[PDB]
Amino acid sequence: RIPNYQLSPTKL
Amino acid sequence: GEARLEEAVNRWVLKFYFHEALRAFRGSRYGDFRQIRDIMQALLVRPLGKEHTVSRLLRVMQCLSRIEEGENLDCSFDMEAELTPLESAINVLEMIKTEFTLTEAVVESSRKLVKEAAVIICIKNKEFEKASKILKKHMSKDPTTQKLRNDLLNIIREKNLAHPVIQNFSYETFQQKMLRFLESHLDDAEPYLLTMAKKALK
């Protein structure tokens, strides 16, 4: 469930 | 044996901070919301027992996380490609669409606001090629948007960031409308640790 319900963004 | 008892409190801890996140989101306190978001993201990897109750709130948290950062185009949740966090909230609202088994009558009214926000935010950040891509791929071309659908492209062609249509859009009321929509489809049951903390400190 790590990217299944991804809540945090990722700075480009 | 002990795995469930860890899964049990994990659901508890997860559902407590989901309540404090909406409560901070409702009070426009997005700093604490962002802090609480990172806590719930850190709980995602942990063994959470397969309960449909938490899968519903995690998708609601997914959507609100993308809306809170929807004005920050320097980040992307769907990082595999480059999708604005409001395009991210569109696909999440479509995953909330199917799994929550909603009639489109209640959903499409909110999907108007997100696709409208996804394009307008791209206009205010002066990435005009981006706005028209979301504008053709997601906007409905139905009558309700036809007045605004035609309105936006003219602005993107003129780069008219001062049009009332763009500057009457307030992002605060857009977030709060998305909150009470997503929240109305969850039940306001008080989290167990919140009740159990009320008894101790009394």
Swiss-Prot record, chain A:
Ubiquitous. Expressed at high levels in testis. Residues 6-12 have a biased composition (Polar residues). The modification Phosphoserine is found at residue 8. Induction: Up-regulated by ionizing radiation (IR). It is found in: Nucleus; Chromosome; Nucleus, PML body; Chromosome, Telomere. Phosphorylated by ATM in response of ionizing radiation, and such phosphorylation is responsible intra-S phase checkpoint control and telomere maintenance. Phosphorylated at Ser-8 by CDK2 in S/G2 phases abolishes interaction with TERF2, enabling DCLRE1B/Apollo recruitment to telomeres. Phosphorylation at Ser-8 in response to dysfunctional telomeres promotes non-homologous end joining repair at telomeres, while dephosphorylation by PPP1CA promotes microhomology-mediated end-joining (MMEJ) repair. Ubiquitinated at Lys-11 via 'Lys-6'-linked ubiquitin chains by RNF8, promoting NBN recruitment to DNA double-strand breaks (DSBs). There is a cross-link at residue 11 (Glycyl lysine isopeptide (Lys-Gly) (interchain with G-Cter in ubiquitin)). Belongs to the Nibrin family. Component of the MRN complex composed of two heterodimers RAD50 and MRE11 associated with a single NBN. The MRN complexes dimerize on DNA to form joined MRN-MRN oligomers required for DNA double-strand break repair. As part of the MRN complex, interacts with MCM9; the interaction recruits the complex to DNA repair sites. Component of the BASC complex, at least composed of BRCA1, MSH2, MSH6, MLH1, ATM, BLM, RAD50, MRE11 and NBN. Interacts with histone H2AX; this requires phosphorylation of H2AX on 'Ser-139' and promotes NBN recruitment to DNA damage sites. (Microbial infection) Interacts with herpes simplex virus 1 protein UL12. It is linked to Nijmegen breakage syndrome: A disorder characterized by chromosomal instability, radiation sensitivity, microcephaly, growth retardation, immunodeficiency and predisposition to cancer, particularly to lymphoid malignancies. Breast cancer: A common malignancy originating from breast epithelial tissue. Breast neoplasms can be distinguished by their histologic pattern. Invasive ductal carcinoma is by far the most common type. Breast cancer is etiologically and genetically heterogeneous. Important genetic factors have been indicated by familial occurrence and bilateral involvement. Mutations at more than one locus can be involved in different families or even in the same case. The FHA and BRCT domains specifically recognize and bind phosphorylated proteins. This is Nibrin. The gene is NBN.
Swiss-Prot record, chain B:
Binds the telomeric double-stranded 5'-TTAGGG-3' repeat and plays a central role in telomere maintenance and protection against end-to-end fusion of chromosomes. In addition to its telomeric DNA-binding role, required to recruit a number of factors and enzymes required for telomere protection, including the shelterin complex, TERF2IP/RAP1 and DCLRE1B/Apollo. Component of the shelterin complex (telosome) that is involved in the regulation of telomere length and protection. It comes from the Eukaryota. The modification Phosphothreonine is found at residue 145. Phosphorylated upon DNA damage, most probably by ATM. Phosphorylated TERF2 is not bound to telomeric DNA, and rapidly localizes to damage sites. Methylated by PRMT1 at multiple arginines within the N-terminal Arg-rich region. Methylation may control association with telomeres. It comes from Homo sapiens. This is Telomeric repeat-binding factor 2. The chain holds residues 86 to 287 of 542 of the full protein. Homodimer. Component of the shelterin complex (telosome) composed of TERF1, TERF2, TINF2, TERF2IP/RAP1, ACD and POT1. Interacts with NBN; interaction takes place with unphosphorylated NBN during G1 phase and prevents to prevent ATM activation and non-homologous end joining repair. Interacts with SLX4/BTBD12. Interacts with DCLRE1B/Apollo and TERF2IP/RAP1; the interaction is direct. Signal peptide: none annotated. The gene is TERF2.
